[PDB]
Amino acid sequence: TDQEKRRQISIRGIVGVENVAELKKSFNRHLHFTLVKDRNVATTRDYYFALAHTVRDHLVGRWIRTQQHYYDKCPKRVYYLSLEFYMGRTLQNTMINLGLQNACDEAIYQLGLDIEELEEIEEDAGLGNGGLGRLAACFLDSMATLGLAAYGYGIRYEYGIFNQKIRDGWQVEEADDWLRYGNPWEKSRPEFMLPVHFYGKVEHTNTGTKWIDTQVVLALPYDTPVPGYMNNTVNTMRLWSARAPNDFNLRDFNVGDYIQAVLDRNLAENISRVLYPNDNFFEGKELRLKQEYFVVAATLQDIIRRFKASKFGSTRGAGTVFDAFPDQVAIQLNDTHPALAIPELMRIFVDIEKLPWSKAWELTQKTFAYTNHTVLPEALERWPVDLVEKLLPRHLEIIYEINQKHLDRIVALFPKDVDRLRRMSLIEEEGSKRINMAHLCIVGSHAVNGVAKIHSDIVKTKVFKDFSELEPDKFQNKTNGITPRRWLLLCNPGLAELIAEKIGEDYVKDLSQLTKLHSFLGDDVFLRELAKVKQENKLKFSQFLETEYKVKINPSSMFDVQVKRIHEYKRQLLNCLHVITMYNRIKKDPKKLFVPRTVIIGGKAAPGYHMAKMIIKLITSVADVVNNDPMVGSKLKVIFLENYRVSLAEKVIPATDLSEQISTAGTEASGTGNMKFMLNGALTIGTMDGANVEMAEEAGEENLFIFGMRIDDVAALDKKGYEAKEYYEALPELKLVIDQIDNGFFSPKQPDLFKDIINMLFYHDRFKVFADYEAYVKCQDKVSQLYMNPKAWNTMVLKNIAASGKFSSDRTIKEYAQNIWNVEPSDLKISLSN
Ligand X SMILES: OC[C@H]1O[C@H](O)[C@H](O)[C@@H](O)[C@@H]1O
Ligand Y SMILES: *Cc1c(COP(=O)(O)O)cnc(C)c1O
- Give the residue numbers of the binding site: 38-40, 71, 305
Residues 6+ apart with CB under 8 A from 251: 261
Side chain identity, residue 750: Q
Identify the residue among 2, 7, 8, 41 touching ligand AMP (CB under 6 A): 41
Cβ proximity to ligand Y, 228 vs 673, nearer residue? 673
Cβ proximity to a copy of itself, 50 vs 662, nearer residue? 50
SS3 call for 834? coil
Residue 131 makes contact with ligand Y by CB under 6 A: yes
Length of the chain: 834
Q: Residue 183 CB: number of other CB atoms within 10 A?
A: 20
Identify the residue among 29, 210, 265, 306 touching ligand AMP (CB under 6 A): 306
Furthest C-alpha separation in the chain:
90
Catalytic site residue from 65, 373, 534, 538: 373
Identify the residue among 16, 22, 71, 742 touching a copy of itself (CB under 8 A): 71
Residue 2 makes contact with a copy of itself by CB under 8 A: yes
Give CA–CA dist 172/162, Å, rounded.
10
C-alpha separations of 70 from 57, 140, 736 in Å: 20, 16, 66
Binding to ligand AMP in span 68-87, by CB under 6 A: 68, 71
User: Which range binds ligand X by CB under 6 A, 619-627, 664-672, 716-724, 747-755?
Assistant: 664-672
Cβ proximity to ligand X, 545 vs 691, nearer residue? 691
Binding to ligand X in span 454-493, by CB under 6 A: 480
Residue 645 makes contact with ligand Y by CB under 6 A: yes
Binding to ligand AMP in span 52-71, by CB under 6 A: 64, 67-68, 71
- Map residues 254-293 to x or -, x wherever contact with ligand AMP holds by CB under 6 A: ----------------------------------------
The alpha carbon of 775 is separated from its chain's Cα centroid by a whole number of angstroms, namely 31
Residues 6+ apart with CB under 8 A from 777: 578, 581, 733
Residue 65 makes contact with ligand Y by CB under 6 A: no
Residue 670 makes contact with ligand X by CB under 6 A: yes
Residue 646 makes contact with ligand Y by CB under 6 A: yes
User: Which range binds a copy of itself by CB under 8 A, 142-150, 182-190, 631-639, 811-819?
Assistant: 182-190
Tell me whether residue 672 is one of the annotated catalytic residues: yes
User: Which range binds ligand Y by CB under 6 A, 126-134, 278-286, 513-521, 531-539?
Assistant: 126-134
Residue 484 makes contact with ligand Y by CB under 6 A: no
- Map residues 110-149 to x or -, x wherever contact with a copy of itself holds by CB under 8 A: xxxxx-----------------------------------
Tell me whether residue 829 is one of the annotated catalytic residues: no
Q: Using the 8-state DSSP alphabet, how is residue 490 labeled?
A: I
Give CA–CA dist 203/212, Å, rounded.
7
Q: Binding partner of residue 285 among ligand Y, ligand AMP, ligand X, none, CB under 5 to 8 Å per kind?
A: none
Residue facing ligand X at closest CB distance: 131
DSSP 240-273: EEEE-TTS--HHHHHHT-TTGGGHHHHHHHHTTT
Q: Is 270 exposed, middle or buried (0-12, 13-18, 19+ CB in 10 A)?
A: middle
Task: Give the β-pairing of 636-641 and 597-602.
Answer: parallel
Q: Binding partner of residue 627 among a copy of itself, ligand Y, ligand X, none, CB under 5 to 8 Å per kind?
A: none
Identify the residue among 168, 191, 589, 827 touching a copy of itself (CB under 8 A): 191
83 and 338 Cβ atoms separated by less than 8 Å: yes
Q: Residue 678 CB: number of other CB atoms within 10 A?
A: 28
User: Which range binds ligand AMP by CB under 6 A, 34-42, 43-51, 480-488, 637-645?
Assistant: 34-42
Tell me whether residue 676 is one of the annotated catalytic residues: yes
Identify the residue among 93, 101, 123, 130 touching ligand Y (CB under 6 A): 130
H-state helical runs in 310-333: 325-328
Residue 6 makes contact with a copy of itself by CB under 8 A: yes
Q: In 3D, which of 52, 652, 669 has the Cα closest to residue 376?
A: 669
- Map residues 350-379 to x or -, x wherever contact with ligand X holds by CB under 6 A: -----------------------x------
Phi then psi dihedrals of residue 660, to 5 deg:
-85, 100
Identify the residue among 18, 122, 123, 158 touching a copy of itself (CB under 8 A): 158
Identify the residue among 131, 326, 444, 481 touching ligand X (CB under 6 A): 131
CB of 150 to a copy of itself, least distance (A): 18
Q: Residue 310 CB: number of other CB atoms within 10 A?
A: 18
Q: Site size for a copy of itself, by CB under 8 A? A: 82
User: Per DSSP, what are the bridge partners of residue 243?
Assistant: 218
Cβ proximity to a copy of itself, 207 vs 281, nearer residue? 281
Cβ proximity to ligand X, 227 vs 686, nearer residue? 686
Q: Residue 488 CB: number of other CB atoms within 10 A?
A: 25
Catalytic site residue from 460, 564, 578, 768: 564
Cβ proximity to a copy of itself, 42 vs 688, nearer residue? 42
Give CA–CA dist 335/670, Å, rounded.
14
Q: Give long-range contacts, CB 8 A cutoff, 24+ apart: 41-49.
A: 44/117, 44/118, 44/121, 45/121, 45/181, 47/111, 47/113, 47/118, 48/91, 48/118, 48/119, 48/121, 48/122, 49/181, 49/182, 49/184
Residues 6+ apart with CB under 8 A from 213: 199, 200, 201
Q: What is the 3-state secondary structure (H, E, C) of 59-93?
A: HHHHHHHHHHHHHHHCCCEEEEECCCCCCECCHHH
Catalytic site residue from 134, 434, 570, 617: 570
Phi then psi dihedrals of residue 574, to 5 deg:
-65, -35
Cβ proximity to ligand Y, 375 vs 823, nearer residue? 375
- CB half-sphere exposure, 783, CA atoms < 13 A: 27
Residue 135 makes contact with ligand X by CB under 6 A: yes
Tell me whether residue 24 is one of the annotated catalytic residues: no
Identify the residue among 63, 85, 153, 773 touching a copy of itself (CB under 8 A): 63
User: Per DSSP, what are the bridge partners of residue 234?
Assistant: 227
H-state helical runs in 160-281: 250-255, 263-270
Q: Binding partner of residue 646 among ligand X, ligand Y, ligand AMP, none, CB under 5 to 8 Å per kind?
A: ligand Y
- Map residues 709-738 to x or -, x wherever contact with ligand AMP holds by CB under 6 A: ------------------------------
Binding residues for AMP: 38-40, 71, 305
Identify the residue among 62, 243, 509, 564 touching ligand Y (CB under 6 A): 564
31 and 46 Cβ atoms separated by less than 8 Å: yes
H or E segment at 374?
A: none
Residues 6+ apart with CB under 8 A from 498: 526, 529, 530, 533
Binding to ligand Y in span 648-677, by CB under 6 A: 649, 671-673, 676
Tell me whether residue 373 is one of the annotated catalytic residues: yes
Tell me whether residue 578 is one of the annotated catalytic residues: no
Catalytic site residue from 565, 567, 578, 799: 565
Give CA–CA dist 682/487, Å, rounded.
13
Cβ proximity to ligand AMP, 38 vs 501, nearer residue? 38
Residues forming contacts to ligand X in the complex (CB under 6 A) are 130-132, 135, 373, 451, 480, 670-673
Residues at the site binding ligand Y, with contacts judged by CB under 6 A: 130-131, 134, 564, 644-646, 649, 671-673, 676
Active site residues: 373, 564-565, 570, 672, 676
